[PDB]
Design a protein around this ligand. Structure first.
Ligand SMILES: [Zn+2]
Ligand SMILES: [Zn+2]
Length: 80
C-alpha cells in the first residue's frame, strides 16, 4: 500500500465577533443541514481552504457533522 487520508477533527474555534456596527451580519445557524441550532464556533480548516460560513453550534455536534463536513472540503472542481 501507499498511504491513507490525513484528515483530523481538532478542537473547533470561536467565531471572531465584532462591535455593534451598522453593517453587521445577523442570523447564525449550524452549518449542518440537520441542525438548526445557534452557530457560535467555526471551522478552522475552512478558513485556510477558503470556504464561506462554516459555523458550528457545539463541538459535540461538530465531531459528528465532521463525518460529512470533511467531504465538503474536497468539492468537485472543474476546468472550463
Ligand atoms: Zn470545514
Ligand atoms: Zn450543530
Amino acid at each position: 500500500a501507499e498511504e491513507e487520508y490525513a484528515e483530523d477533527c481538532p478542537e473547533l474555534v470561536p467565531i471572531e465577533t465584532k462591535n455593534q456596527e451598522m453593517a453587521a451580519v445577523e442570523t447564525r445557524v449550524c452549518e449542518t443541514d440537520g441542525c438548526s441550532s445557534e452557530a457560535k464556533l467555526q471551522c478552522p480548516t475552512c478558513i485556510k481552504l477558503g470556504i464561506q460560513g462554516s459555523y458550528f453550534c457545539s463541538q459535540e455536534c461538530f465531531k459528528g457533522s465532521w463525518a460529512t463536513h470533511k467531504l465538503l472540503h474536497k468539492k468537485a472542481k472543474d476546468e472550463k
